[PDB]
């Protein structure tokens, strides 16, 4: 019940919430008749759920206490697609900060096991932020013409 | 806004919570060095998540407003395996009642579309409760010898 | 001769010894007619040997002097199987500490090459300890009924 | 910009130059009718070009400004093959220091993303230096009999 | 001494620079979220690198002195896609003039070997300029709607 | 506590040491950039380890007490390849004498089981000595030109 252990438990809660927020965004797009975007974020939700369970497994492997948490309410209302994509990007940037902080705390406590465990999550965040940003920029370029945004997703993503 | 619509939104929240509770149970078993049981409940959690998304799809298809909800805190501590199996059984029985009540409300409101949608969930609940009950009785017959409970799961489930 | 270099040479000695200790354990189990366990530790011995040789290779690649060492006498007498599994778990925990200390020394000496080299060994240790611990708990749950311990190894390991 | 960002831009310049130097070395060997070595360095040049573009991708992914640079003049005149090999080894050793320095700067600035990115490059440098050194020692053992050097490359590289 | 030999050496420098300019343009597109264009120019850079090495091989085959040169700084800043496409076209037109001038100089010096060698490069330039021009015209037609330019590249290039 | 039993226990110690000595020799070669030789001795080490285990198995099969022993320090320093090959040859000759002595002791004690068990080891020793001797003679014929020694190993071994 060290600081790294407390933070990993928090990180499990954050990823479960992140995942739920993706489902919400995916369902929004579905509603909006943007099947390509929906398909992507459904898939992204399952990915975040996987990250949550990688964290869970780390605590399991080390006999540290792990609790499956509840999930905070997530945002369902968006004025337009671009606002949902903006939320997603902000979320992955936020998760990136959290992973950085986890790394720093492990270093500080001489938890070399936890420190190396966080390394994979860092490369993943790089690529995930890169994609979420691209989508935001493409959505800006598309403006009201969401057909083009969807075409882009279909071919490039 | 109709009563069936309001109850379906609640059901989505209930299933997301049910699914989360199954993960908690699977993780428990995992930590208790009982892989067959953990494997089953991991699996069961994904199934409940699916039911949640069938409900979501139903509202999507009907242009009824749907919100991806948060998730209540779920139970992580269990004195023994048999207690977790008991919770699971109790949960599926409770979901069964909820599905019954949804059916009744639909009948009452002349929501013939919702009524028929619930029918598949009814058969599924029969078989799920039947299984959870069998696990409970088998756990009782096994007593402290969880090896036998695990052998049963491995061969019969 | 740098401190990281000297510690790596010690680590080579440690892993060759670790390996030899696993063989001893494997042979004990073989004697005891617990073939599943024996088969596991024979295999574990070969793995440790490989770790020793990954360390050797690191020194070869860097034109650092490397000596193939002798091996300390290892434990052959075990009252009970749980006793042998306990030794294995303690050994893997001790190796984990050694690898952490190597990491720290590298960081301290600005040996960035050695520091990153250790990272793989850290993740391996997490999984190896996790397994040794599981075997100890399962052995405890089996008590005098080693048949059940063997059955567990045969299906789950 | 930021120091890690500035050093990464420099590293892109360095790798593009390194690659160019390898081409020069390969062409030298080609001129000399030492095909096995030339084949190797042609290949090595493409690898360095790849490293340059991994660095470029890293800045792309992070929306950091990246410029494709020019390339410094490189060495074309070599008295003997030993001379070229030595240069390659020196270059590899130099690149290794540059990569270490990048890691250090990242650590210092709390750039955890850049720090983990550098780790792969560290392992690669170990193996590349190891090889370049082997070629230098083999060339020394061969002396004026370059046929033996070439036979070694053909079988072992 | 000879003038054709001096000009080929310059041409090696020019193609290495051309190639680097293409990488720069590809990276620009990449950062601009225009992958089809990026993908094309990455590919075009490798091609120009090949032309440089065809020239190098010509000198090798004739025992004329060849130096792998450095590379001039290349243009990285573009106001819009159409400006980069314009530069590419201008570049291939310029390379075409240089190849014509090489041909003329070979004729003038009775270098029949060099003269015939340049012939392949002439047909290649015809097709390369044709494509770069088409891309400029298509980009003009597309205006601000880069999606259409990208679609064109995807299907026709 | 019978002479054959006590000698077999010693032989296990000897073969574990022999094996470790071969690793040392292989690592020496590896460091010397003589991969064909190193490859052979790595392989020879694994073979000696197998002989050790065969003996252990024989003790196990007969319910005779067996201990996995430690290993004496082994030789790491050699002035030249030929010296390491000389050691190897002398070692296999020594192991041959040890195996002969084991046979003799078994005959003397009317241990017919152990006597026949040793027979396989005799034929293996013949072939292993023959090879080690050949390597020594070929190394002598090669003198300082180790390339030729390596060529011989590559084609004939």
Q: How many helices (H) and strands (E) does chain B have?
A: 5, 0
Closest by Cβ to C155, choosing from B33, B146, B154: B154
Would you tell me which residues 106-125 of chain A have a C-beta closer than 8 angstroms to some C-beta of chain C? 110, 112-113, 116-117, 119
H/E element, C21 = helix C3-31
Specified resolution (Å) = 2.8
Chain D residue at shortest CA distance from C118: D123
Q: Which among A92, A100, A138 is the top mutation candidate for probing chain D, defined by the most D β-carbons within 10 Å of its own β-carbon? A: A100
Spatial distance between the Cα atoms of B104 and B87, rounded to a whole number of angstroms: 26
C-alpha count within 13 angstroms, C-beta hemisphere, residue D112? 23
Render A36-101 in DSSP notation, one character per residue. Answer: HHHHHHHHHHHHHHHHHHHHHHHHHHTT-------B-------SSHHHHHHHHHHHHHHHHHHHHH
R_g of chain B computed on alpha carbons: 17
Specify the 3-state DSSP secondary structure of B71.
strand
CA nearest to A3, candidates A83, A64, A73, A94: A64
Spatial distance between the Cα atoms of F46 and D138, rounded to a whole number of angstroms: 28
Q: Which chains touch A (3 or more CB pairs under 8 A)?
A: B, C, D, E
Interchain CB contact of B71 with A (< 8 Å): yes
Q: Is F49 left (phi over 0), alpha (psi -120 to 50) or beta?
A: alpha
Specify the 3-state DSSP secondary structure of E2.
coil
Closest by Cβ to C68, choosing from F16, F23, F60: F23
**Helix runs in C32-111, H state only:** 35-61, 81-108
Specify the 3-state DSSP secondary structure of C30.
helix
Spatial distance between the Cα atoms of B146 and B34, rounded to a whole number of angstroms: 8
Q: Which among F12, F71, F84 is the top mutation candidate for probing chain C, defined by the most C β-carbons within 10 Å of its own β-carbon? A: F71
* Cβ–Cβ under 8 Å, residues D21 and D91: yes
Closest by Cβ to B147, choosing from C134, C137, C148: C148
Taking the CA atoms of A121, A126, A130 and A132 in sequence, report the sign of the dihedral they define: positive
H/E element, D68 = none
* Cβ–Cβ under 8 Å, residues A69 and A16: yes
Spatial distance between the Cα atoms of B74 and F33, rounded to a whole number of angstroms: 62
* Cβ–Cβ under 8 Å, residues B99 and B113: no
Nearest 5°: the CA angle A104, A108, A113 is 80
Spatial distance between the Cα atoms of D1 and F142, rounded to a whole number of angstroms: 61
* Cβ–Cβ under 8 Å, residues A69 and A3: no
Cβ burial of D99 (10 Å; 0-12, 13-18, 19+) is buried
Spatial distance between the Cα atoms of A134 and A155, rounded to a whole number of angstroms: 14
* Cβ–Cβ under 8 Å, residues C103 and C110: no
Provide the 8-state DSSP code for B98: H
Closest by Cβ to E67, choosing from D17, D67, D76: D76
Asked if the Cβ–Cβ distance from E31 to D60 is below 8 Å, we say: yes
Spatial distance between the Cα atoms of D157 and F36, rounded to a whole number of angstroms: 13
Taking the CA atoms of E137, E141, E142 and E143 in sequence, report the sign of the dihedral they define: positive
* Cβ–Cβ under 8 Å, residues D135 and D82: no
Cβ-based neighbours of B148, under 8 Å, separated by 6 or more: B141, B142
Spatial distance between the Cα atoms of B53 and E156, rounded to a whole number of angstroms: 41
Chain D residue at shortest CA distance from A119: D116
Interchain CB contact of F86 with C (< 8 Å): no
Asked if the Cβ–Cβ distance from C61 to D127 is below 8 Å, we say: yes
Interchain CB contact of E31 with D (< 8 Å): yes
Round to the nearest angstrom and report the end-to-end CA distance of chain C: 42
Three-class secondary structure assignment of D74-114: CCCCCCCHHHHHHHHHHHHHHHHHHHHHHHHHHHHHCCHHH
Asked if the Cβ–Cβ distance from A113 to C103 is below 8 Å, we say: no
Chain A residue at shortest CA distance from E147: A148
Q: Which among D95, D97, D103, D118 is the top mutation candidate for probing chain C, defined by the most C β-carbons within 10 Å of its own β-carbon? A: D103
Interchain CB contact of C130 with D (< 8 Å): no
Residues of F in contact with D133 (CB under 8 A): none
Long-range CB contacts for residues B34-39, cutoff 8 Å, separation at least 24:
B34/B81, B34/B146, B34/B149, B34/B150, B35/B150, B35/C156, B36/B150, B36/B153, B36/B154, B36/B157, B37/B81, B37/B149, B37/B150, B37/B153
**Helix runs in chain E, H state only:** 3-31, 35-61, 81-108, 112-142, 146-156
* Cβ–Cβ under 8 Å, residues B84 and A51: no
> Which residues share a beta bridge with E71?
D71
Residues of D in contact with F33 (CB under 8 A): 134, 137-138, 141
Count of residues making up chain D: 157
Specify the 3-state DSSP secondary structure of B111.
coil
Residue D143 has phi, psi (to 5 degrees) of 60, -120
Exposure string for E33-59, b = 16+ CB within 10 A, e = fewer: bbbbbbbbbbebbeebbebbbebbebb
Specify the 3-state DSSP secondary structure of E110.
coil
Asked if the Cβ–Cβ distance from E68 to D23 is below 8 Å, we say: yes
* Cβ–Cβ under 8 Å, residues E97 and E50: no
H/E element, C1 = none
The C-alpha of F17 sits at a distance from chain C's nearest C-alpha, in angstroms, of: 8
Closest by Cβ to A123, choosing from D63, D110, D116: D116
* Cβ–Cβ under 8 Å, residues F10 and F67: no
Spatial distance between the Cα atoms of E53 and E51, rounded to a whole number of angstroms: 5
Interchain CB contact of A60 with D (< 8 Å): no
Cβ-based neighbours of E101, under 8 Å, separated by 6 or more: E7
Provide the 8-state DSSP code for B34: -
Closest by Cβ to C123, choosing from A63, A110, A116: A116
Chain B residue at shortest CA distance from A78: B67
Interchain CB contact of F96 with D (< 8 Å): no
Number of D–F residue contacts, CB under 8 Å: 13
Count of Cβ atoms closer than 10 Å to residue E133 Cβ: 15
Specify the 3-state DSSP secondary structure of E71.
strand
Cβ-based neighbours of A146, under 8 Å, separated by 6 or more: A32, A34, A81
* Interrupted after residues, chain C (C–N over 2.5 Å): none
Spatial distance between the Cα atoms of E34 and A152, rounded to a whole number of angstroms: 10
Nearest 5°: the CA angle F109, F114, F115 is 75
Taking the CA atoms of E75, E154, D63 and E78 in sequence, report the sign of the dihedral they define: positive
Interchain CB contact of D63 with A (< 8 Å): yes
**Helix runs in chain D, H state only:** 3-31, 35-61, 81-109, 112-142, 146-156
* Cβ–Cβ under 8 Å, residues B148 and B31: no
* Cβ–Cβ under 8 Å, residues A123 and A10: no
Cβ-based neighbours of A13, under 8 Å, separated by 6 or more: A69, A70, A71
| CA distances from residue C6 to B40, C57, C92, C104 in whole angstroms, order as listed | 49, 15, 21, 14
Count of Cβ atoms closer than 10 Å to residue E76 Cβ: 17
Interchain CB contact of B33 with A (< 8 Å): no
Spatial distance between the Cα atoms of E42 and C124, rounded to a whole number of angstroms: 39
Spatial distance between the Cα atoms of D66 and B93, rounded to a whole number of angstroms: 60
Spatial distance between the Cα atoms of A103 and A97, rounded to a whole number of angstroms: 10
CA nearest to D54, candidates D124, D105, D111, D108: D124
Interchain CB contact of C134 with B (< 8 Å): yes
* Cβ–Cβ under 8 Å, residues F148 and F43: no
| CA distances from residue D2 to D23, D106, D109, E27 in whole angstroms, order as listed | 32, 10, 9, 21
Spatial distance between the Cα atoms of D39 and D37, rounded to a whole number of angstroms: 5
* Cβ–Cβ under 8 Å, residues D133 and D89: yes
Spatial distance between the Cα atoms of F69 and F15, rounded to a whole number of angstroms: 10
* Cβ–Cβ under 8 Å, residues E64 and E116: no
Domains of chain F: 1-157 (1.20.1260.10)
Residues of A in contact with B31 (CB under 8 A): 60, 66
Render C135-149 in DSSP notation, one character per residue. Answer: HHHHHHHHTT-HHHH
CA nearest to F51, candidates F19, F9, F85: F19
Cβ-based neighbours of B59, under 8 Å, separated by 6 or more: B5, B8, B9, B12, B65, B66
| CA distances from residue F22 to C62, C68, F16, F137 in whole angstroms, order as listed | 22, 10, 10, 19
Spatial distance between the Cα atoms of D112 and A104, rounded to a whole number of angstroms: 9
Spatial distance between the Cα atoms of B131 and B147, rounded to a whole number of angstroms: 19
CA F54 to centroid of chain Cα atoms: 13
* Cβ–Cβ under 8 Å, residues E87 and E25: yes
Provide the 8-state DSSP code for C71: B
Specify the 3-state DSSP secondary structure of D62.
coil
Residues of F in contact with D156 (CB under 8 A): 35
CA nearest to B1, candidates B62, B47, B64: B64
Asked if the Cβ–Cβ distance from D100 to C119 is below 8 Å, we say: no
Spatial distance between the Cα atoms of B18 and B53, rounded to a whole number of angstroms: 13
Asked if the Cβ–Cβ distance from B31 to A60 is below 8 Å, we say: yes
Render chain F in DSSP notation, one character per residue. Answer: --HHHHHHHHHHHHHHHHHHHHHHHHHHHHHTT-HHHHHHHHHHHHHHHHHHHHHHHHHHHTT-------B-------SSHHHHHHHHHHHHHHHHHHHHHHHHHHHHTT-HHHHHHHHHHHHHHHHHHHHHHHHHHHHHHHTT-HHHHHHHHHHH-
Count of Cβ atoms closer than 10 Å to residue F45 Cβ: 22
The C-alpha of C117 sits at a distance from chain D's nearest C-alpha, in angstroms, of: 7
Provide the 8-state DSSP code for E40: H
* Cβ–Cβ under 8 Å, residues B142 and C148: no
* Cβ–Cβ under 8 Å, residues E108 and E7: no
CA nearest to B32, candidates A66, A27, C108, E21: A66
* Cβ–Cβ under 8 Å, residues C68 and F74: yes
Provide the 8-state DSSP code for D71: B
Q: Between A81-108 and A112-142, two packed helices, what is the crossing angle to 10 degrees? A: 160
CA nearest to F51, candidates F20, F97, F11, F87: F11
| CA distances from residue E148 to A82, E155, F4 in whole angstroms, order as listed | 21, 11, 88
Specify the 3-state DSSP secondary structure of B74.
coil
* Cβ–Cβ under 8 Å, residues E51 and E91: no
Residues of F in contact with C24 (CB under 8 A): 67-68
Cβ burial of B8 (10 Å; 0-12, 13-18, 19+) is buried
Q: Which residues of B are documented as binding site for Fe cation?
A: 15, 48, 51, 92, 125
Chain A residue at shortest CA distance from C98: A112
Residue B98 has phi, psi (to 5 degrees) of -60, -40
* Cβ–Cβ under 8 Å, residues E33 and A153: no
Residue B71 has phi, psi (to 5 degrees) of -140, 130
Spatial distance between the Cα atoms of E129 and A48, rounded to a whole number of angstroms: 48
> Which residues share a beta bridge with F71?
C71
Residue E32 has phi, psi (to 5 degrees) of -90, 5
Q: Which among F32, F33, F38, F154 is the top mutation candidate for probing chain D, defined by the most D β-carbons within 10 Å of its own β-carbon? A: F33
Peptide bond into E2 cis (omega under 30): yes
């Amino acid at each position: 019940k060290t600081k790294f252990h407390a933070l990993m438990q928090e990180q499990i809660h954050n990823e479960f919430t992140a995942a739920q927020q993706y489902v919400a965004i995916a369902v929004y797009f579905d509603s909006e008749d943007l099947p390509q975007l929906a398909k992507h974020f459904y898939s992204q939700a399952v990915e975040e759920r996987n990250h949550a369970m990688m964290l869970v497994q780390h605590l399991l492997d080390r006999d540290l206490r792990v609790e499956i948490p509840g999930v905070d309410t997530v945002r369902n209302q968006f004025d337009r697609p671009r606002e949902a994509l903006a939320l997603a990007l902000d979320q992955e940037r936020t998760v990136t900060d959290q992973v950085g902080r986890l790394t720093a705390v492990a270093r500080d406590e001489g938890d070399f096991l936890g420190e190396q465990f966080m390394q994979w999550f860092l490369q993943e965040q790089i690529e995930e932020v890169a994609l979420m940003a691209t989508l935001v920029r493409v959505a800006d370029r598309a403006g009201a013409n969401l057909f083009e945004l969807e075409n882009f997703v279909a071919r490039e993503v």
